[PDB]
Design an enzyme around this catalytic site. Structure first.
Site, PDB file in Angstrom:
ATOM      1  N   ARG A 158       1.251   5.104  -4.809  1.00 48.07           N
ATOM      2  CA  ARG A 158       0.023   5.228  -4.031  1.00 48.07           C
ATOM      3  C   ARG A 158       0.365   5.346  -2.552  1.00 48.07           C
ATOM      4  O   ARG A 158       0.934   4.419  -1.981  1.00 48.07           O
ATOM      5  CB  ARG A 158      -0.882   4.014  -4.279  1.00 48.07           C
ATOM      6  CG  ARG A 158      -2.248   4.114  -3.634  1.00 48.07           C
ATOM      7  CD  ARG A 158      -3.111   2.918  -4.022  1.00 48.07           C
ATOM      8  NE  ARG A 158      -4.523   3.287  -4.028  1.00 48.07           N
ATOM      9  CZ  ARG A 158      -5.451   2.727  -3.261  1.00 48.07           C
ATOM     10  NH1 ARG A 158      -5.127   1.747  -2.423  1.00 48.07           N
ATOM     11  NH2 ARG A 158      -6.707   3.145  -3.338  1.00 48.07           N
ATOM     12  N   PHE A 189      -2.686   4.445   6.454  1.00 45.98           N
ATOM     13  CA  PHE A 189      -2.981   3.149   5.866  1.00 45.98           C
ATOM     14  C   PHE A 189      -1.681   2.514   5.374  1.00 45.98           C
ATOM     15  O   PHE A 189      -1.170   1.579   5.998  1.00 45.98           O
ATOM     16  CB  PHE A 189      -4.001   3.315   4.733  1.00 45.98           C
ATOM     17  CG  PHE A 189      -4.430   2.027   4.087  1.00 45.98           C
ATOM     18  CD1 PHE A 189      -4.200   0.798   4.695  1.00 45.98           C
ATOM     19  CD2 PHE A 189      -5.072   2.048   2.856  1.00 45.98           C
ATOM     20  CE1 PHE A 189      -4.598  -0.386   4.084  1.00 45.98           C
ATOM     21  CE2 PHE A 189      -5.475   0.867   2.246  1.00 45.98           C
ATOM     22  CZ  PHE A 189      -5.229  -0.350   2.860  1.00 45.98           C
ATOM     23  N   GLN A 229       2.485   2.316  -1.088  1.00 44.35           N
ATOM     24  CA  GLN A 229       2.580   1.255  -2.074  1.00 44.35           C
ATOM     25  C   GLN A 229       3.529   1.637  -3.197  1.00 44.35           C
ATOM     26  O   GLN A 229       3.492   2.760  -3.717  1.00 44.35           O
ATOM     27  CB  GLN A 229       1.226   0.914  -2.661  1.00 44.35           C
ATOM     28  CG  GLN A 229       1.288  -0.228  -3.637  1.00 44.35           C
ATOM     29  CD  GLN A 229      -0.084  -0.606  -4.143  1.00 44.35           C
ATOM     30  OE1 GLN A 229      -1.093  -0.179  -3.583  1.00 44.35           O
ATOM     31  NE2 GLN A 229      -0.128  -1.411  -5.202  1.00 44.35           N
ATOM     32  N   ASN A 281      -1.159  -7.686  -4.691  1.00 39.44           N
ATOM     33  CA  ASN A 281      -1.510  -8.736  -5.630  1.00 39.44           C
ATOM     34  C   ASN A 281      -2.848  -8.384  -6.255  1.00 39.44           C
ATOM     35  O   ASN A 281      -3.487  -7.397  -5.882  1.00 39.44           O
ATOM     36  CB  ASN A 281      -1.555 -10.110  -4.948  1.00 39.44           C
ATOM     37  CG  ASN A 281      -2.620 -10.198  -3.868  1.00 39.44           C
ATOM     38  OD1 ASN A 281      -3.807 -10.020  -4.135  1.00 39.44           O
ATOM     39  ND2 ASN A 281      -2.198 -10.488  -2.640  1.00 39.44           N
ATOM     40  N   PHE A 326       3.553  -3.186  -0.250  1.00 42.31           N
ATOM     41  CA  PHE A 326       3.206  -1.989   0.485  1.00 42.31           C
ATOM     42  C   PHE A 326       3.809  -2.033   1.870  1.00 42.31           C
ATOM     43  O   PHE A 326       4.034  -3.096   2.449  1.00 42.31           O
ATOM     44  CB  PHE A 326       1.711  -1.772   0.575  1.00 42.31           C
ATOM     45  CG  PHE A 326       0.960  -2.951   1.122  1.00 42.31           C
ATOM     46  CD1 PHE A 326       0.560  -3.977   0.287  1.00 42.31           C
ATOM     47  CD2 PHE A 326       0.636  -3.007   2.464  1.00 42.31           C
ATOM     48  CE1 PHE A 326      -0.152  -5.050   0.787  1.00 42.31           C
ATOM     49  CE2 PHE A 326      -0.069  -4.069   2.963  1.00 42.31           C
ATOM     50  CZ  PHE A 326      -0.462  -5.093   2.120  1.00 42.31           C
ATOM     51  N   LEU A 361      -6.190  -7.667   6.089  1.00 42.99           N
ATOM     52  CA  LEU A 361      -5.380  -8.215   5.015  1.00 42.99           C
ATOM     53  C   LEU A 361      -4.786  -9.576   5.350  1.00 42.99           C
ATOM     54  O   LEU A 361      -4.235 -10.224   4.459  1.00 42.99           O
ATOM     55  CB  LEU A 361      -4.254  -7.248   4.671  1.00 42.99           C
ATOM     56  CG  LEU A 361      -4.728  -5.841   4.288  1.00 42.99           C
ATOM     57  CD1 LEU A 361      -3.536  -4.971   3.965  1.00 42.99           C
ATOM     58  CD2 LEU A 361      -5.660  -5.910   3.101  1.00 42.99           C
ATOM     59  N   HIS A 363      -2.685 -11.293   1.803  1.00 42.08           N
ATOM     60  CA  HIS A 363      -1.421 -10.735   1.336  1.00 42.08           C
ATOM     61  C   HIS A 363      -0.286 -11.352   2.143  1.00 42.08           C
ATOM     62  O   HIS A 363      -0.406 -11.524   3.360  1.00 42.08           O
ATOM     63  CB  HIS A 363      -1.411  -9.216   1.493  1.00 42.08           C
ATOM     64  CG  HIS A 363      -2.489  -8.535   0.716  1.00 42.08           C
ATOM     65  ND1 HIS A 363      -2.261  -7.934  -0.504  1.00 42.08           N
ATOM     66  CD2 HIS A 363      -3.817  -8.406   0.960  1.00 42.08           C
ATOM     67  CE1 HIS A 363      -3.398  -7.441  -0.967  1.00 42.08           C
ATOM     68  NE2 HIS A 363      -4.355  -7.711  -0.096  1.00 42.08           N
TER      69      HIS A 363
END
Length: 164
Positions: free
Chosen positions: A54, A59, A62, A101, A112, A121, A125
């Protein structure tokens, strides 16, 4: 003292370049050790050969699902999941390495690489590392992503391990 690990990235089998990461073992030892061991493969499984499933430009990138290659799998060196260690470190800009997660205390092997500041986040995370060299290679990986995260070409960790 903090370990440095590397990924050699390949696009459709063609070598792209090397990214190295500093892992903040001084502050998140259990999380950092999981990533380090998965990068050397020293426990018999790990990241070598797995893909970045991904990639959302602007952004993050991942990866780390080495068992189902699509965001549904992976496992830590501690078992199927392990706890959120702490939230000392924050998502402060591009190059941050953070754990994916599925809710509280669900860390496995997916991670990521942030390519932007992702402050929302923080506290959800676990941040455990940062890109040391090859941020330009991460920026190159980005150009193969898309708005929904699907990659136009297969981005794989052709090799990985520990440098220091």
């Amino acid at each position: 003292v903090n370990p440095t690990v590397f990924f050699d990235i390949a696009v459709d089998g063609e070598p792209l370049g090397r990214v190295s990461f500093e892992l903040f073992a001084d502050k998140v030892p259990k999380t950092a050790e999981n990533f380090r061991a998965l990068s050397t493969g020293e426990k018999g499984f790990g990241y070598k050969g797995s893909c970045f499933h991904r990639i959302i430009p602007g952004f993050m990138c991942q990866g780390g699902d080495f068992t189902r290659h699509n965001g549904t799998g992976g496992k830590s060196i501690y078992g199927e999941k392990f706890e959120d260690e702490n939230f000392i470190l924050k998502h402060t800009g591009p190059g941050i390495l953070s754990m994916a997660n599925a809710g509280p205390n669900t860390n496995g092997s997916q991670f990521f690489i942030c390519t932007a500041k992702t402050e929302w986040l923080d506290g959800k995370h676990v941040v455990f590392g940062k890109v040391k060299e090859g941020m330009n290679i991460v920026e190159a990986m980005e150009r193969f992503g898309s708005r929904n995260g699907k990659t136009s070409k297969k981005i794989t960790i052709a090799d990985c391990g520990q440098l220091e």
